[PDB]
Design an enzyme around this catalytic site. Structure first.
Site, PDB file in Angstrom:
ATOM      1  N   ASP A  86      -2.599 -51.935  11.045  1.00  0.00           N
ATOM      2  CA  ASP A  86      -2.897 -53.306  10.698  1.00  0.00           C
ATOM      3  C   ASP A  86      -1.861 -53.923   9.566  1.00  0.00           C
ATOM      4  O   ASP A  86      -2.056 -54.981   8.689  1.00  0.00           O
ATOM      5  CB  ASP A  86      -4.494 -53.458   9.962  1.00  0.00           C
ATOM      6  CG  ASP A  86      -5.349 -52.897  11.438  1.00  0.00           C
ATOM      7  OD1 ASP A  86      -5.620 -51.721  11.974  1.00  0.00           O
ATOM      8  OD2 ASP A  86      -6.029 -54.049  12.015  1.00  0.00           O
ATOM      9  N   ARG A 113      -1.483 -60.062   5.290  1.00  0.00           N
ATOM     10  CA  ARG A 113      -2.993 -60.754   5.194  1.00  0.00           C
ATOM     11  C   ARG A 113      -3.806 -59.850   4.060  1.00  0.00           C
ATOM     12  O   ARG A 113      -4.777 -59.582   3.408  1.00  0.00           O
ATOM     13  CB  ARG A 113      -3.983 -61.147   6.309  1.00  0.00           C
ATOM     14  CG  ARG A 113      -3.974 -59.845   7.344  1.00  0.00           C
ATOM     15  CD  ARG A 113      -5.273 -60.590   8.074  1.00  0.00           C
ATOM     16  NE  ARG A 113      -5.730 -59.552   9.303  1.00  0.00           N
ATOM     17  CZ  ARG A 113      -3.724 -60.051  10.098  1.00  0.00           C
ATOM     18  NH1 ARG A 113      -2.929 -61.303  10.471  1.00  0.00           N
ATOM     19  NH2 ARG A 113      -4.302 -59.626  11.897  1.00  0.00           N
ATOM     20  N   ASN A 114      -2.802 -58.342   4.416  1.00  0.00           N
ATOM     21  CA  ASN A 114      -2.963 -56.916   3.826  1.00  0.00           C
ATOM     22  C   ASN A 114      -3.014 -56.559   2.834  1.00  0.00           C
ATOM     23  O   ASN A 114      -2.814 -55.042   2.345  1.00  0.00           O
ATOM     24  CB  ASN A 114      -3.377 -56.035   4.797  1.00  0.00           C
ATOM     25  CG  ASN A 114      -5.257 -56.049   6.082  1.00  0.00           C
ATOM     26  OD1 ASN A 114      -6.036 -56.275   5.679  1.00  0.00           O
ATOM     27  ND2 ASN A 114      -4.141 -55.713   7.550  1.00  0.00           N
ATOM     28  N   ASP A 153      -5.733 -52.424   2.965  1.00  0.00           N
ATOM     29  CA  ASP A 153      -6.262 -52.522   4.489  1.00  0.00           C
ATOM     30  C   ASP A 153      -7.654 -53.048   4.497  1.00  0.00           C
ATOM     31  O   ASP A 153      -8.353 -52.656   4.043  1.00  0.00           O
ATOM     32  CB  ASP A 153      -6.228 -51.677   5.681  1.00  0.00           C
ATOM     33  CG  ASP A 153      -7.482 -52.238   6.951  1.00  0.00           C
ATOM     34  OD1 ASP A 153      -8.661 -51.910   6.371  1.00  0.00           O
ATOM     35  OD2 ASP A 153      -6.008 -52.271   7.754  1.00  0.00           O
TER      36      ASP A 153
HETATM   37  C1  LIG Z   1      -6.883 -47.103  -0.400  1.00  0.00           C
HETATM   38  C2  LIG Z   1      -6.656 -48.737   0.052  1.00  0.00           C
HETATM   39  C3  LIG Z   1      -5.426 -47.889   1.752  1.00  0.00           C
HETATM   40  C4  LIG Z   1      -3.904 -48.441   0.792  1.00  0.00           C
HETATM   41  C5  LIG Z   1      -3.167 -48.991   1.351  1.00  0.00           C
HETATM   42  C6  LIG Z   1      -3.369 -48.456   3.578  1.00  0.00           C
HETATM   43  C7  LIG Z   1      -4.082 -48.675   3.529  1.00  0.00           C
HETATM   44  C8  LIG Z   1      -5.077 -48.253   5.317  1.00  0.00           C
HETATM   45  C9  LIG Z   1      -3.909 -48.695   6.409  1.00  0.00           C
HETATM   46  N1  LIG Z   1      -4.392 -48.705   7.623  1.00  0.00           N
HETATM   47  C10 LIG Z   1      -5.940 -48.688   7.319  1.00  0.00           C
HETATM   48  N2  LIG Z   1      -6.251 -48.373   5.692  1.00  0.00           N
HETATM   49  C11 LIG Z   1      -5.243 -48.375   3.226  1.00  0.00           C
HETATM   50  N3  LIG Z   1      -8.071 -48.693   1.002  1.00  0.00           N
HETATM   51  C12 LIG Z   1      -9.175 -47.974   1.640  1.00  0.00           C
HETATM   52  C13 LIG Z   1     -10.368 -47.841   1.692  1.00  0.00           C
HETATM   53  C14 LIG Z   1     -11.204 -46.648   2.558  1.00  0.00           C
HETATM   54  C15 LIG Z   1     -11.661 -46.067   1.022  1.00  0.00           C
HETATM   55  C16 LIG Z   1     -12.197 -45.066   1.244  1.00  0.00           C
HETATM   56  C17 LIG Z   1     -13.134 -45.182   2.767  1.00  0.00           C
HETATM   57  C18 LIG Z   1     -12.359 -45.405   4.004  1.00  0.00           C
HETATM   58  C19 LIG Z   1     -12.761 -45.701   5.102  1.00  0.00           C
HETATM   59  N4  LIG Z   1     -11.982 -46.304   5.729  1.00  0.00           N
HETATM   60  N5  LIG Z   1     -11.281 -47.635   4.736  1.00  0.00           N
HETATM   61  C20 LIG Z   1     -11.170 -46.999   3.442  1.00  0.00           C
HETATM   62  C21 LIG Z   1     -10.058 -49.761   2.549  1.00  0.00           C
HETATM   63  O1  LIG Z   1     -11.263 -49.956   2.850  1.00  0.00           O
HETATM   64  N6  LIG Z   1      -8.935 -50.246   1.557  1.00  0.00           N
HETATM   65  C22 LIG Z   1      -7.700 -49.861   1.731  1.00  0.00           C
HETATM   66  O2  LIG Z   1      -7.224 -51.057   1.180  1.00  0.00           O
END
Ligand SMILES: C[C@@H](c1cccc(-c2c[nH]cn2)c1)n1cc(-c2cccc3cn[nH]c23)c(=O)[nH]c1=O
Length: 286
Positions: free
Chosen positions: A144, A148-149, A162
């Site tokens: 994703d 926006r992220n 995300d």
């Molecule tokens: C650390 C961070 C993060 C940083 C860089 C990339 C991504 C990414 C790429 N594709 C999907 N996520 C996520 N992060 C983590 C969580 C999260 C934490 C713990 C458990 C779960 C289960 N789902 N998401 C979880 C979240 O909700 N949002 C968020 O910004």
């Protein structure tokens, strides 16, 4: 085993105070709230508490603990850190993130009160490239990546993040979960092979990154505005791409064209994108 492994990721009421009255954002996954994290000395850390209001069964909960273990390891300046997860006996599980003073990158560049220069936009994209190079080194596929992220902290440092549905382990579950909740697929950011085969790799993240560079150089304009979500595949198969923005240097648009290469193995890696975009960035004065 999974329970023993996830303990270092868990945070509780001894450190965290979630302000359920202070709503930061509303989404398909649930809400985001202002939070306070008090450390052992007594000092306060301002944070954002993402509530994942749909995770209920054994398979969902266990996939969530697995994701928390993976994302708790993240430590890079261009990657939003995971402070911890709340596994409450009552109420939906919560994700605790550091609070981002200037919000998401798309909102920041679309705001008429903000005036970022072309160098600032190229620089924001350079920060996203560095964050994605780190994620790619962990074999972590974003799926994703979009403006926006990408969050902007108090120091204007871009953090890749995300703010959508809970992360799944399998690509087969990604389509299954978006259809079960009515959350739309990020079609206009997906690579051609992802649209046709339903699979995601780091090479399809490189495709999404090109679209993100285009969002930055247009100050948050919607990609392919006049092309229906269902017409995107034919449009791409025909060889058509996003057109060069008005204030986008020729070498930066060439980089975007390489990201949108129909052959996934021919796209640049994030390490090449960091090297190329730093060279473009340095030619901009200011
Ligand atoms: C650390 C961070 C993060 C940083 C860089 C990339 C991504 C990414 C790429 N594709 C999907 N996520 C996520 N992060 C983590 C969580 C999260 C934490 C713990 C458990 C779960 C289960 N789902 N998401 C979880 C979240 O909700 N949002 C968020 O910004």
């Amino acid at each position: 085993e999974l329970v023993q492994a996830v303990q270092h990721v868990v945070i509780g009421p001894s450190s965290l105070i979630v302000h359920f009255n202070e709503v930061i954002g509303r989404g398909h996954f649930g809400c985001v709230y202002h939070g306070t994290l008090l450390d052992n000395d007594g000092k306060k850390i301002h944070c954002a508490v993402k509530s994942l209001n749909r995770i209920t069964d054994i398979g969902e909960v266990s996939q969530f603990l697995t994701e928390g273990i993976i994302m708790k390891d993240f430590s890079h300046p261009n990657v939003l850190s995971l402070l911890g997860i709340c596994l409450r006996s009552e109420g939906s599980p919560l994700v605790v993130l550091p609070y981002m003073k200037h919000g998401d990158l798309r909102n920041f560049i679309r705001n008429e009160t903000h005036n970022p220069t072309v160098k600032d936009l190229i620089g924001f994209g350079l920060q996203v490239a560095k964050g994605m190079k780190y994620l790619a080194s962990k074999k972590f596929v974003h799926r994703d990546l979009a403006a926006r992220n990408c969050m902007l902290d108090e120091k204007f440092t871009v953090k890749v993040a995300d703010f959508g549905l809970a992360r799944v382990m399998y690509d087969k579950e990604y389509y299954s979960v978006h259809n079960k909740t009515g959350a739309k697929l990020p079609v206009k950011w997906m690579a051609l092979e992802s649209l046709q085969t339903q699979k995601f790799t780091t090479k399809s993240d490189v495709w999404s990154f090109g679209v993100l560079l285009w969002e930055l150089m247009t100050r948050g304009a919607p990609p392919y505005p006049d092309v229906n979500t269902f017409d995107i595949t034919v449009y791409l198969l025909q060889g058509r791409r996003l057109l060069q923005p008005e204030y986008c240097p020729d070498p930066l648009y060439e980089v975007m064209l390489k990201c949108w290469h129909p052959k996934a193995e021919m796209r640049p890696s994030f390490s090449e994108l960091v090297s190329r975009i730093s060279a473009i960035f340095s030619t901009f004065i200011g």
